[PDB]
Nucleic acid binder design. Structure first.
Ligand SMILES: C[S@@+](CC[C@H](N)C(=O)[O-])C[C@H]1O[C@@H](n2cnc3c(N)ncnc32)[C@H](O)[C@@H]1O
Lengths: 227, 121, 366
RNA sequence: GAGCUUCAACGGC
RNA sequence: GCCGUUGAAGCUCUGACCGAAAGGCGUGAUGAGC
């Protein structure tokens, strides 16, 4: 009893599931592969994967009305903090075959989960690396359209600026999810986001700052433009 | 909705445990904090243990759930660490607490246990 | 001037014009694993050589270690990260690699990854417990074998016992020099030995009370020394592996207290899981197993810390604060250990900064 | 020398 | 059923405060023999 409607963002679909409630979903790029245990649904002939705002952040952002979403079919994106690939699989549905993703994940036991998945998803390169030392992935990657960063590190603002000089192509955008306590657990969140916003703006233009509650406590997702 | 909560808990229940503490905080023996709680479990006897659902790093209490089938003690979840802190008699929070001696709640401590043994299944 | 790629190493002038390019002769991921980290390999070295006889004396790479190794090799080198090269390979990759460029960037990319990552799993925490127990067993034997070599070779050259107290040095003497008459300036200074050292020695050599040794009684004292030198090497091989394997075991624990101290605690605990389940009060005093027993026995003053004493902040601070920094650290291990056991996501940088800052507190109040 | 987990005998509501 | 004096056996640092206040603190205050 689920009906799938197109969503303002290309490669993102809206679903109304049995109870009449709306949810968001991408279209499964590799039919018949469960990446994180996500609910899968079938519209006319094809699999769509519900993108749960609770297990994702890009996802919480989109449910919370994110206006700017640079990540579209065909786009190339450098994904810092890719992990098991929960959300990254979604942006791999959106990007599509004609797109490219470079995942960069610092901890090997975790990136490992993602590796066997990228066998059928030929548009993600799992790359073991430290998002702090961009140069140490230098030959692995190539200039991208967008930079997604979910890393929960204290330098993440700078981590994003450093990669942005290296890999983010002029006119492209970046997006970063900030976990307040991660930067400072002493100072007040709207103050952390203040400082992060000023820091970011020395390099970028900050065009959007979208608080992430109810799904995450004290996180916000900035989207910035590289001039 | 964390990943270390192995089952849902009702509006009540989660409320029932919370008070189960307040009547042991005077009449019985109680220990607060995730360490003293952890001790109490490997110490082989504490009668029931309580774990907040809002915790982060969400792993600091992740060990109690496995630890408690080991020592075979029942556990339950309250929704807020802070509610549980003021519950246990402290102005700060508690990621978890263990009931050492039930006191008045002996009966109450008892009934809550059996409600838990169903939905751990 | 020079940037790497998934195909070969490339050289561009100040205009972006392609000078010379050397495709990898080895497996692309194997050369890359080296080059990216900053170490220098065949095809690069063989490259800038063919470049040196060009008219190019001027070099700039994308990594600060590549530059070090290059000038320490005689080439003038500098570091500008994005530079005229990387900007060209990573800008118009099809120009170089053809339209499947991304597909290639794929084959290698995942190839380097499956090479950098340990397979499967599951006792590798108990393996680090061997490597560690092994690692410090190889210490108890290097100390025996060295005690012998000392007592032994001292029959022939007794004086050298006190002129070379640093064992690896004594041992490279016996191995490299051999018979006491093989001593002379050139070989002594290659041991890295100093000057006063090279001068003493001979002053105690040239007149010695040592017994004589035939090339037969010497070769076997050399086979002892040459063996300890194999144990020193096996030590390093045990260290490299404790390091490399904490990446799959407790990245957080490793980033927090160091690969080595963390393997210790995993060791006292009995495994990563047994270390997870521990109340940080336990982790505090791990290793103190003896001084702990006489607490619950003679009611003695409890040990403020175990193995963790190794933490710089604890052992270089006055005894005034040691106890507080003790559990201040124990707490953060408890967490790193539980993150490590359950997910393995890397939170260590938050953990550190929360700990550095707690420590200033402890310092400021005393 | 304390303390909790545990198991034959003993005192009792 | 509760309870108790126990007996060999095995396990276990402590646990609500520091601040003149501002604050910090059970996500561990305080005391303490690696
Ligand atoms: C996917 S996000 C958060 C996921 C979690 N479910 C929350 O919400 C965090 C990931 O970033 C990785 N990471 C942390 N620091 C990093 C760094 N400096 N460079 C690259 N990756 C990093 C961690 O291993 C972690 O898996």
């Amino acid at each position: 009893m689920v009906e799938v409607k197109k969503h303002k963002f290309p490669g993102v679909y809206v679903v109304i599931d049995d109870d009449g409630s709306e949810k968001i979903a991408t279209k499964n790029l590799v039919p018949g592969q469960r990446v994180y245990g996500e609910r899968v649904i079938k519209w006319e002939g094809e699999e769509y994967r519900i993108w749960n705002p609770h297990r994702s952040k890009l996802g919480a952002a989109i449910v919370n009305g994110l206006k700017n979403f640079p990540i579209k079919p065909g786009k190339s994106v450098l994904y810092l903090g890719i992990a098991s690939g929960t959300t990254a699989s979604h942006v791999s549905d959106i990007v599509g075959w004609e797109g490219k993703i470079y995942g960069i994940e610092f901890s090997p036991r975790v990136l490992r989960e993602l590796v066997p998945i990228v066998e059928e998803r030929r548009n993600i390169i799992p790359i073991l690396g430290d998002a702090t030392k961009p140069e140490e992935y230098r030959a692995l990657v190539t200039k991208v359209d967008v930079i997604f960063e979910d890393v929960a590190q204290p330098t993440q603002a700078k981590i994003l600026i450093d990669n942005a000089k290296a890999y983010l192509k002029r006119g492209g955008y970046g997006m970063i999810a900030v976990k307040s306590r991660s930067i400072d657990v002493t100072k007040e969140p709207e103050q952390v986001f203040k400082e992060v916003e000023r820091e970011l703006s020395e390099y970028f233009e900050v065009i959007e700052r979208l608080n992430l509650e109810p799904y995450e406590k004290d996180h916000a997702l900035f989207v910035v433009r590289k001039p | 909705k964390p990943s270390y909560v192995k089952f849902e808990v009702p509006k009540e229940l989660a409320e029932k445990a919370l008070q189960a503490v307040e009547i042991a905080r005077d009449t019985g023996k109680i220990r607060k904090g995730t360490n003293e709680t952890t001790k109490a479990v490997e110490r082989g006897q504490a009668k029931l243990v309580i774990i907040a659902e809002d915790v982060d790093p969400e792993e600091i209490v992740a060990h109690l759930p496995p630890l408690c089938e080991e020592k075979e003690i029942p556990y339950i979840y309250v929704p807020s660490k802070k509610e549980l802190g003021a519950a246990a008699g402290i102005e700060v929070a508690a990621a978890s607490v263990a009931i050492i001696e039930p006191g008045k709640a002996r009966d109450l401590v008892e009934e809550i246990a059996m409600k838990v043994k169903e939905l751990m299944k | 001037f020079i940037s790497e790629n998934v195909r070969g190493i490339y050289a561009f002038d100040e205009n972006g014009n392609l000078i010379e390019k050397r495709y990898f002769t080895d497996k692309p991921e194997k050369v890359l694993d080296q080059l990216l980290k900053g170490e220098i390999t065949k095809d690069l070295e063989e490259l800038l050589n063919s470049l040196k006889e060009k008219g190019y004396d001027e070099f700039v790479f994308e990594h600060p270690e590549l530059s070090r190794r290059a000038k320490e090799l005689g080439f003038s080198a500098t570091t500008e990260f994005p530079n005229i090269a990387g900007e060209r390979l990573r800008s118009n990759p099809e120009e170089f690699l053809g339209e499947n460029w991304f597909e290639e960037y794929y084959k290698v990319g995942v190839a380097l990854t499956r090479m950098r990552i340990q397979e499967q799993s599951g006792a590798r925490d108990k393996m680090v417990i061997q490597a560690i127990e092994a690692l410090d067993d190889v210490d108890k034997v290097i100390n025996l074998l060295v005690a012998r070599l000392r007592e032994w070779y001292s029959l022939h050259f007794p004086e050298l016992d006190e002129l070379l107290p640093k064992h690896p040095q004594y041992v490279a003497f016996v191995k490299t020099v051999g018979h006491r008459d093989n001593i002379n300036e050139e070989v002594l200074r290659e041991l890295g030995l100093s000057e006063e050292k090279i001068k003493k020695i001979l002053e105690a050599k040239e007149k010695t009370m040592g017994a004589w040794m035939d090339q037969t009684d010497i070769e076997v004292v050399r086979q002892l020394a040459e063996e300890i030198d194999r144990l020193y090497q096996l030590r390093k091989k045990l260290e490299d592996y404790i390091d490399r394997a904490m990446d799959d075991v407790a990245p957080n624990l490793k980033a927090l207290v160091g690969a080595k101290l963390a393997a210790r605690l995993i060791s006292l605990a009995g495994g990563l899981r047994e270390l997870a389940m521990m109340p940080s009060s336990t982790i505090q005093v791990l290793g103190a197993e003896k001084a702990l027993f006489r607490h619950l026995r003679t009611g003695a003053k409890p040990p403020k810390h175990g193995v963790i004493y190794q933490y710089p902040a604890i052992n270089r601070s006055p005894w005034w604060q040691r106890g507080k920094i003790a559990r201040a650290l124990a707490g953060k291990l408890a967490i790193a250990a539980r993150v490590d056991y359950f997910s393995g996501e890397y939170i260590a940088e938050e953990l550190k900064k929360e700990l550095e800052a707690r420590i200033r507190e402890i310092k400021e109040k005393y």
